[PDB]
Design a binder for this molecule. Structure first.
Ligand SMILES: CCCCCCCCCCCCCCCCCC(=O)OC[C@H](COP(=O)(O)O)OC(=O)CCCCCCCCCCCCCCCCC
Ligand SMILES: CCCCCCCCCCCCCCCCCC(=O)OC[C@H](COP(=O)(O)O)OC(=O)CCCCCCCCCCCCCCCCC
Lengths: 62, 70
């Protein structure tokens, strides 16, 4: 792929997408509804299953 | 170890994500009244039988002591 030709093709094709308001950016949405980690437990029991799948995770890094 | 067929979803919360003894003060009068509502009849029939038979026996013993007097 050539960079200049892809620039020209993208400006012709994808040039009409709307811009973004500053108040509705990705960072504002991340601040408005943040992630919360809760230490908890769930199992989904089945009466006649064969396998036993399980995952244990800790709160990791962004 | 005794396979049990069952279908469920179980949820559990960490013991460091909830309180320990704060609800114990709210539920204490209700639990007191519920305990006496559940065990009221048995405790009452126990008390009636024990104290009635004891009182009748002690009364008749006192009458027996009085009958020996001159
Ligand atoms: C304090 C020390 C208490 C010493 C006696 C223990 C009494 C425990 C409570 C007895 C029932 C109270 C009650 O709410 O009565 C239910 C009820 C009225 O309360 P409610 O129906 O719960 O609103 O009354 C009864 O059924 C009779 C209660 C007295 C029974 C003879 C003793
Ligand atoms: C002459 C010698 C004199 C001696 C004087 C002292 C005698 C002992 C002290 C007085 C005891 C009397 C009151 C006792 C109260 C205790 C608490 C209680 O009963 O609650 C439990 C109980 C509590 O239930 P709960 O709160 O549900 O656990 O109360 C009852 O259910 C009521 C019990 C009533 C039944 C006993 C009544 C007294 C019996 C006397 C019988 C006399 C017969 C006479 C026959 C001959 C006639 C010629």
């Amino acid at each position: 792929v050539n960079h200049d030709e892809l620039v020209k093709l993208a400006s012709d094709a994808f040039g009409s997408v709307p811009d973004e308001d500053a108040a509705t950016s990705v960072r504002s949405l991340l601040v408005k509804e943040p992630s919360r980690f809760t230490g908890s437990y769930v199992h989904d029991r089945f009466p006649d299953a064969s396998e036993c799948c399980m995952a244990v995770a800790f709160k990791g890094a962004s | 170890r005794q396979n049990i067929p069952l279908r469920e979803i179980l949820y559990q919360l960490s013991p460091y994500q909830q309180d320990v003894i704060r609800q114990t003060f709210t539920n204490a009068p209700k639990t007191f009244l519920r305990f006496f509502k559940e065990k009221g009849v048995g405790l009452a029939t126990f008390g009636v039988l024990f104290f009635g038979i004891k009182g009748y026996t002690e009364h008749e013993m006192h009458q027996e002591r009085l009958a020996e007097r001159y």
